[PDB]
Paper text:
Members of the DAPK family are generally involved in both apoptotic and autophagy pathways and share significant overall sequence similarity with myosin light chain-related kinases and triple functional domain protein-related kinases (Temmerman et al., 2013). They also contain a basic loop (BL) in the kinase N lobe next to the kinase active site, which has been identified as a DAPK-family-specific signature motif (Tereshko et al., 2001). We found an identical type of dimer arrangement in all three kinases that involves the BL of the CD.
Both the hDAPK1 and hDAPK2 constructs encompass the CD and ARD segments. The dimeric interface areas are in the range of 930–1,600 Å2 in size. This area is smaller in the DAPK1 dimer than in the DAPK2 and DAPK3 dimers, as we were unable to model most of the BL region in this kinase due to weak electron density. By contrast, for hDAPK1 there is a substantially higher level of diversity in terms of possible arrangements. This is supported by a comparative SEC experiment under the conditions we have established here showing that hDAPK1 tends to be considerably more monomeric than hDAPK2. Therefore, we speculate that the inhibition of CD-mediated homodimerization of hDAPK1 may have a less pronounced role in regulating hDAPK1 activity than other family members.
Author numbering: 4 to 47, 51 to 302, 308 to 312
Amino acid sequence: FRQENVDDYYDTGEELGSGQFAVVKKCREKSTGLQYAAKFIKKRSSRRGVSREDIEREVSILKEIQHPNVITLHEVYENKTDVILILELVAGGELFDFLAEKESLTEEEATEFLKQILNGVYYLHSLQIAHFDLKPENIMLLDRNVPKPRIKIIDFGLAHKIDFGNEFKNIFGTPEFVAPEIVNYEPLGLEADMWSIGVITYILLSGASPFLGDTKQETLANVSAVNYEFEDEYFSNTSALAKDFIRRLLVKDPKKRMTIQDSLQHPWIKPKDTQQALSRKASAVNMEKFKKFAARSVRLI
Ligand SMILES: [Mg+2]
């Protein structure tokens, strides 16, 4: 990690964000004039700060990843109190906020945006990296003011390189979005991201959250038992192909769940014939419900 003062290389401005042991400022690199985001992460052994091990794992994954749909790490600095990630400036806001500004969305147009999400995940999974926190607030746009906005997956704070010879178990993430193996403290791997893609998709089409209960206890029980329905109220204009794609992801047994590669060949994403393309063209997002959803931190432990 770079030992120089980040201020010698960057001018820093306004706060873009803050979470528990971090703050994000917009910054401009002095030698090039280009803008980035600088995330200052408080170093911890002490119940304040992020552990060295977690900081290093997240940085080691960011340094590896280079793909148009995943946020890029520029440089990393360190002083006595922080680690500072200089990151690509991802300034278009959340995908669902952007989609909720539109009047309508066919299933065909929704798959367009989903496909960029699938391609970023396809790349991560091909490097044996599980993201482990896929949910709408981690799916952003690079710049909303262009003909075809680019999706960026962000926030690799929970990402792990999958180790063939050693099971990984942990309890983390947001209850609405975590796979049953996370709720049951079972072996975790790439499949958990696939389940969360199923949840993002179900919400994208309906504006409803599939497993959400009135309490945290109920949500977790719903997740663990895979207890969800496609209610007519929300899903009466959704194609059978959509619902099949979701059904193939929201699967208790991780070995039976569709993989990223399968997902990208699914006929709802890649129709094999005219009939399938027409079925997709005839269905559309429940935009009135989806707008309420977009207009509405939360942790497993
Ligand atoms: Mg986030």
